């Protein structure tokens, strides 16, 4: 199945709320956490703590302590180069994508005030700046060719290495399949008019696909977002207002038809 590993970094110029936070995710699951008020890398999922040695946490904590410091300095410089008044935020994101077909994807990005700032191209070994301020950072990061090379390999090989490892450490949670409970109920969305809701719940992974059909043709369709139920399973829905309709549904390989 198609999986991902991505770590996020967050820096805030005027904290209350920690100045720096970093959290890792295997798919939609938080697996690691670090903040400026604990100054210690801790696990989020129990299977992480069980499988990773005490030395792992010790070593990445010193790494993260140093990364926090670099984020402080970068955010101060960005703030001053903009002569930006008030509170501002710096964000980093790095990840993996081990696709079902064996292919991979790697990405590395930065964002100042929640808007794309520097995007890394691992094939060209370049940085994509959004403006004249981002550009002077690009000029400096593109100078150190060794770091660019180091990054490409981290994303292309090392990141996938780690992802595959974690998938084995938590195969009972990440590699599980909990099929949806699909139900169709008719409920008048306004006076006179009548709609059909295709409510689906208790499914995992959260990736699902709902849709309506008119004797076979795809219908005009109102939707409900995929939402966490709180039990580790997700929920979703879709709806439409003389013709015979059916709710065609696809989740984690199996595809369902619910003719009404």
């Amino acid at each position, epitope marked *: 199945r198609t999986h991902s590993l991505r770590y996020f970094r967050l820096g805030v110029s005027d904290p209350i709320v920690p100045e720096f936070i970093s959290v890792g995710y295997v798919d939609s699951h938080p697996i690691t956490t670090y903040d400026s008020v604990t100054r210690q890398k801790e696990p989020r999922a129990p299977w992480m703590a069980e499988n990773l040695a005490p*030395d*792992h946490w010790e*070593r*990445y904590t*010193q*790494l993260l*302590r*140093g990364w926090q*410091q*670099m984020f402080k300095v970068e955010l101060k410089r960005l703030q001053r180069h903009y002569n930006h008044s008030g509170s501002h935020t710096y964000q980093r994101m790095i990840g993996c994508e081990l696709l079902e077909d064996g292919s991979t994807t790697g990405f590395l990005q930065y964002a100042y005030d929640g808007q794309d700032f520097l995007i890394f191209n691992k094939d060209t070994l370049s940085w994509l700046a959004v403006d004249n301020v981002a550009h002077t950072i690009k000029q400096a990061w593109e100078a*150190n060719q*060794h*770091e660019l*090379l*180091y990054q*490409k*390999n*981290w994303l292309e*090989e*090392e990141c996938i*290495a*780690w992802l595959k490892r974690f998938l084995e450490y938590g195969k009972d949670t990440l590699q599980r399949t909990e099929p949806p409970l699909v139900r169709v109920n008719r409920k008048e969305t306004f006076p006179g008019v009548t709609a059909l809701f295709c409510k689906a719940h208790g499914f995992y992974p959260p990736e699902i696909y709902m849709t309506w059909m008119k004797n076979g043709e795809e219908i005009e369709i109102d939707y409900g977002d995929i939402l966490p139920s709180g039990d580790g399973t997700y929920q979703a829905w879709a709806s439409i207002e003389s013709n015979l309709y059916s709710c065609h549904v696809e989740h984690s390989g199996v595809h369902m038809v619910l003719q009404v």
Partner: antibody
Amino acid sequence: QNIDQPTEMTATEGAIVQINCTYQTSGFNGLFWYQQHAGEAPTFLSYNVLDGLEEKGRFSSFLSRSKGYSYLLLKELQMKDSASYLCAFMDSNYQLIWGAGTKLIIKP
Amino acid sequence: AVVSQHPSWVISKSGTSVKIECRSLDFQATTMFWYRQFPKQSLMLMATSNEGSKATYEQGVEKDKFLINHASLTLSTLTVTSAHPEDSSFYICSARTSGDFGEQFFGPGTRLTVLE
């Protein structure tokens, strides 16, 4: 998890010399070649992280991540090259794992 | 980048305490290293200096004999408390780059010889 390179190497002045370095590790984030003359601190020579041979003058540094193997190639060898050549790689948790270093003896 | 470490050579009696300072003359170093090279042996790492954190020691190193502290972001200082002729060695300082790939920059020297 360990790294290996020859203890000592002797070669005639003017010929190509290949210092092989072979590792094995769970994780890898690049390989360094350092040069260190007797009673002095080491000085950077190279950083290979992607597969292939990379030239940098008289010296060359090759890497095969797949074969867990690297080599420093000193060609058109000189008397000044009698030094010690340290090999080290960055493992999974960004720790530098040093080799014992090859002592290169240039016979004229 | 350049790292400088003073003194270059030092002679001290058995029982005294010698302090080797180490400064990165350009950039600020979040982490600095302490290496040692007994004649004749490989370059062995003995400690890791970290800003806003404690000092990490290795297999042989005894936290009671050496006193490393991250003074500034430019300065790290190793202090040999109660020196003995067995402690006499070549002490190299190192500073890691800001970037993650981990290139180190070494200080030249120091040659410490303890004499009773």
